[PDB]
Write an enzyme that holds these catalytic residues in place. Structure first.
Site, short mmCIF file in Angstrom:
data_model
loop_
_atom_site.label_atom_id
_atom_site.label_comp_id
_atom_site.label_asym_id
_atom_site.label_seq_id
_atom_site.Cartn_x
_atom_site.Cartn_y
_atom_site.Cartn_z
N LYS A 161 0.88 -1.16 0.00
CA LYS A 161 0.00 0.00 0.00
C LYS A 161 0.92 1.22 0.00
O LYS A 161 1.56 1.52 1.00
CB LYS A 161 -0.88 0.00 1.25
N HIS A 288 -10.56 -6.65 -7.73
CA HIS A 288 -10.24 -5.77 -6.62
C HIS A 288 -11.11 -6.18 -5.44
O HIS A 288 -12.25 -6.60 -5.62
CB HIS A 288 -10.54 -4.32 -7.02
#
Length: 360
Positions: A161, A288
């Site tokens: 991330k 996703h």
């Protein structure tokens, strides 16, 4: 005839645990045949409100009439955005589940049949995994954690991330790659980098041969600019999130890989459609994850299982699940097994559902 008699909506809070809380809206579609379909989607109050406003319109309709349903609610996403698609998706999934049950067939078999039975997933690592690390130590810290997760989880892919600290993200990725030479590596800044910083960082990351750079910057315009200069496959689930975005993105050459997501695109058929679009334009595709639990993950597994282009390790926060309103899905050695029973292949515990709705 098979008509829908009831559409009930619950908002629930389920605990999450990292083996190394969340709110969801659950929907049940009841048919005058006794058959029931279940669906799960993101968020609570606002999404649950949209579903109830659509419920009256489904009473008396066949769960098989999805085309009619979507057309009827086409302006919902126009006003409600993401939550609109997510509300619609919950109902969409419940109808597919009901269809499989009414036909005694798995949703997978109603989508073209299985081409794969195991679905690899991805391990997400964030800076939040190295609380003690200092800027100079963060890279090594993350690499060690990455190695641990991969060996303890058996993941084929790892995703970092990203943050507004481009230089730091790059430093981390270099360390992770050096420590894991053969893992599929990705980075998702969630459009936090500027275009100029995306180009500079992207260039620096080319030597790491990442599977893809996910949403480094905002918009089709910015993404197209990154693609023009950076030699890394570019992925998105932010600048192309509806078909109205597809044509423009293709003409502007903005992406190389697109992330599907039933809850973001409004349904299963839309996602199968997107898969077709990707093959036609030579785009890679993956799914996703927006926090899907058992029911939602089950719907996704049926899609992946019947879709050739979805050959990558998908994003899935399912390994963070604790208690759920259905029986746990088979997650072993970094892969999820596609359920086998009729419909989605899962059974819902109403007592728990009622329990977690009270927690919310």
């Amino acid at each position: 005839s098979l008509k829908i008699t009831d559409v009930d909506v619950w908002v629930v809070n389920l605990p999450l645990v990292n083996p190394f809380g969340e709110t969801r809206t659950v929907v049940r579609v009841r048919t005058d045949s006794g058959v029931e379909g279940w669906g799960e989607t993101m968020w609570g109050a606002p999404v649950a409100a949209i579903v109830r406003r659509m419920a009256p319109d489904l009473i008396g309709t066949s769960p098989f009439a999805l085309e009619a349903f979507h057309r009827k609610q086409h302006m919902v996403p126009f006003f409600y955005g993401y939550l609109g698609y997510a509300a619609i998706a919950a109902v969409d999934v419940a109808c597919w589940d009901a269809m499989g049950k009414a036909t005694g067939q798995s949703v997978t078999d109603l989508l073209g049949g299985a081409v794969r039975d195991e679905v690899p997933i991805t391990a997400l690592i964030t800076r939040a995994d190295a609380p003690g690390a200092t800027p100079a130590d963060l890279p090594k810290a993350m690499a060690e954690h990455a190695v641990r997760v991969v060996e303890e989880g058996g993941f084929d892919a790892v995703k970092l991330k990203g943050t507004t600290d481009c230089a730091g993200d790059v430093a981390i990725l270099r360390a992770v790659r050096e420590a894991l030479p053969g893992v599929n590596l990705r980075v998702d800044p969630n459009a936090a980098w500027s275009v100029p910083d995306s180009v500079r960082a992207g260039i620096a990351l080319e030597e790491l041969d990442l599977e893809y750079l996910e949403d480094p910057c905002v918009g089709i315009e910015g993404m197209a600019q990154v693609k023009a200069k950076v030699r890394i496959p570019l992925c998105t689930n932010m600048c192309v999130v509806r078909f109205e975005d597809f044509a423009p993105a293709m003409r502007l050459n903005a992406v190389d890989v697109i992330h599907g997501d039933v809850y973001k695109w409004g349904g299963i058929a839309a996602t199968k459609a997107l898969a077709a679009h990707c093959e036609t334009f030579g785009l890679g595709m993956n799914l996703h994850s927006g926090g899907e639990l058992g029911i939602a993950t089950a719907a996704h597994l049926a899609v992946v299982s019947s879709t050739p282009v979805l050959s990558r390790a998908i994003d899935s926060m399912y390994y963070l699940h604790a208690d759920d309103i259905i029986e746990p899905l088979h997650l072993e050695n970094g892969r999820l097994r596609v359920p086998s029973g009729p419909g989605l292949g899962v059974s819902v515990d109403e007592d728990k559902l009622r329990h977690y709705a009270g927690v919310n």
